[PDB]
């Protein structure tokens, strides 16, 4: 019931700024002790900043001091991270967490901040159809988008097992591309079709491409 739902990530140009929200339910942020933690792609966890809003104590890592402002609005029950003068090495997945005992018990889902000069590109989704077994595979191809991430689910989250969504690959063009497959009985083709739900938030694209045996 105690939850942290954070938002505000996405794409920013170098030198530009961005603000991250961390909305709480199940507890008061004001009396609590909120911490921000980042994780550059393929790296360890790194502490960034913290706030005890009631006491007024705000703390920052030498890495981000003077660029970042931590704050909290009590009425909204939300903690914020204002990030200014962003650079390449700020590109990471930022988490917010709640201090407890002497650890962080409740964490946010983590939002992705990507600092790049390239502009936002929407993905085009292409079907991967089975041919003429016992068990056969089908899926979608989410090609040419920027930046990360893309969310692929099947039949509005109703179909889960058999599903493999591959981690995206950086292409020569600088754009991303991934594939998402699923295996199903070879006697289900025709009278049972499946819909993949592609969602690229930065570009506002919600494609529902139904894959059919052809």
């Amino acid at each position: 019931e105690v939850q942290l739902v954070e938002s505000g990530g996405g794409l920013v140009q170098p030198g530009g700024s961005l603000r991250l929200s961390c909305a709480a339910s199940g507890f008061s942020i004001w009396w609590s002790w909120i911490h921000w933690v980042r994780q550059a792609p393929g790296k360890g966890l790194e502490w960034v900043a913290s706030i005890s809003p009631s006491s007024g104590w705000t703390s920052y890592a030498d890495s981000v001091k003077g660029r970042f402002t931590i704050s909290a609005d009590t009425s909204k029950n939300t903690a914020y991270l204002q990030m200014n003068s962003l650079r390449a090495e700020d590109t990471a997945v930022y988490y917010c967490a709640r201090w407890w005992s002497s650890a962080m018990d409740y964490w946010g889902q983590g939002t992705l901040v990507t600092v790049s000069s390239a502009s936002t590109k929407g993905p085009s989704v292409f079907p991967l159809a089975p041919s003429s077994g016992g068990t056969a595979a089908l899926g979608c191809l989410v090609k040419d988008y920027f930046p990360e991430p893309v969310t692929v689910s099947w039949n509005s989250g109703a179909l889960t097992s058999g599903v493999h969504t591959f981690p995206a690959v950086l292409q020569s063009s600088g754009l991303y591309s991934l594939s998402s497959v699923v295996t199903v009985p070879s006697s289900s083709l025709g009278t049972q079709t499946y819909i993949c739900n592609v969602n690229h938030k930065p570009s506002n694209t919600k494609v529902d491409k139904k894959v059919e045996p052809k």
Partner: protein, 605 residues
Amino acid sequence: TQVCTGTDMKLRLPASPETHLDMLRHLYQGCQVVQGNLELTYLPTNASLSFLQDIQEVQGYVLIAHNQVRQVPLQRLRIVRGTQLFEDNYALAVLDNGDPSPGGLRELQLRSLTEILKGGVLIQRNPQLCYQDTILWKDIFHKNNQLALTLIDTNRSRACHPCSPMCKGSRCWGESSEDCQSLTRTVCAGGCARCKGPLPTDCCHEQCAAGCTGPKHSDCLACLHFNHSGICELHCPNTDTFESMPNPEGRYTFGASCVTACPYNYLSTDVGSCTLVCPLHNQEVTAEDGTQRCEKCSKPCARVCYGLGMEHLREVRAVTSANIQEFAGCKKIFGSLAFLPESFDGDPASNTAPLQPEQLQVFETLEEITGYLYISAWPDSLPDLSVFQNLQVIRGRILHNGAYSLTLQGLGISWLGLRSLRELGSGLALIHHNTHLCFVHTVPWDQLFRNPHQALLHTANRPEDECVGEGLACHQLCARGHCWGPGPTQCVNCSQFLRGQECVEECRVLQGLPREYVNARHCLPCHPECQPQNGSVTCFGPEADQCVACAHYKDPPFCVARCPSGVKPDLSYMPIWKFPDEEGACQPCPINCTHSCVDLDDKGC
């Protein structure tokens, strides 16, 4: 000071045995009259107890129990009054001293005790104790029926030496020659409640207790009722006679003495007494001195927040989710606050949910507690006691365990954050076993206490030498190195200037975001219509008439955004129409209407 509080912990095992004796020591060092119960319990063998040596008089009961120490030096104790009794029957209770070279109380040595006014004596299970059976208790008692409430066990693990050869008739409090029992009642002439000898001329004044040195009411060893500056009297001072004599006016009855004015933390009554609690139909007004007084309500008495040990919560032992809402919006609680493990775990026997952390918000308005604050459990989410951010005084008129006005134990908060706390009226503070807690020794307790007989007792918190880095010691900008927690928002006193809650190096007087003036070490914003000045003062106050120069137009004497256009400063005043200069000063319009005027004039009036 000579008058001190007692304790009220009975046979309960000490909450921190490490600093239990230190409690006793601070409490009784120099004390002569114990306004309550003298409880000397759980004292280890080597225990240094010389701080008791001035106790002369006890109001409540004397309870000497569960000690391994061989003697308690209470030689100057003359009288126990028994205003309160142990187990509702006993004025002196000496219980379980020594296990069932060897430990245990050997002698009582109450060589001066000659009056127990109320209740009996209970002496039991003291394997090393000698001579208690020797004492003629009847003499010490005020009335004979007090004998009927006396039980004196003589089971013993050792042979006793005889009383000193110099002892009257084999009655003593110990092996010493000055340990003989002095009889002041059963040995008397004629009437006489107390005598200094067996002749009629050896009677003590009607108003003495314990005995005397002569016949006058100034020769008393103790006052039976009240001590009026060295004269024992039946009453504290409606005149019948046409004259005036010495001995100052009228007095307040405080304990068993008449005094000029009530002591520091007490309350004077219309009935002419000092108290720690007002009667019904009564408020509590603070004089310009800081003096408190109970007085009848002229209207019906207004709403009052009662804490624990008061009104409907007099039996309730802790703040739970059942009564947390009762403190909503309270600026001043009349009673105490206690947070126990059972507060946040929640008793599953009664349908009482565990109290949630954000429910402690109710206490955000709180400024004053008359009783005590006790915290033995706190939510693991909360790093500090910031919900008590605004608490200014804890009077301690009611003390937890009869001794402590502020107790913080077993918490695992990292800092305190009680940043408005300026006064602990009376009692000791105890902060122990908070393994994570720093900023305990960065607080100037010397300034929170009032009398110099109170102190902080601390043990098993985070080591002092381990509170050193950032987030662990006071901020640079805190004055005199005093703070309630980390950062420039936790200073006790501010080294330079305050911008709201924060300690800052400089106000934006000459340079900065929005310009500021200083007022009483406070950074405060200039009016938006002030024009920022190059390396010079921008404004002198918050009002738009206090700018050095205007950012836009000026409308004497104000710096304005635009010149008045048909505004009326109030009703019945005709509207004021103006236009700007080439310079920027707002100028009045000419002849009324047709050309209603503005810069180059407009119709429609």
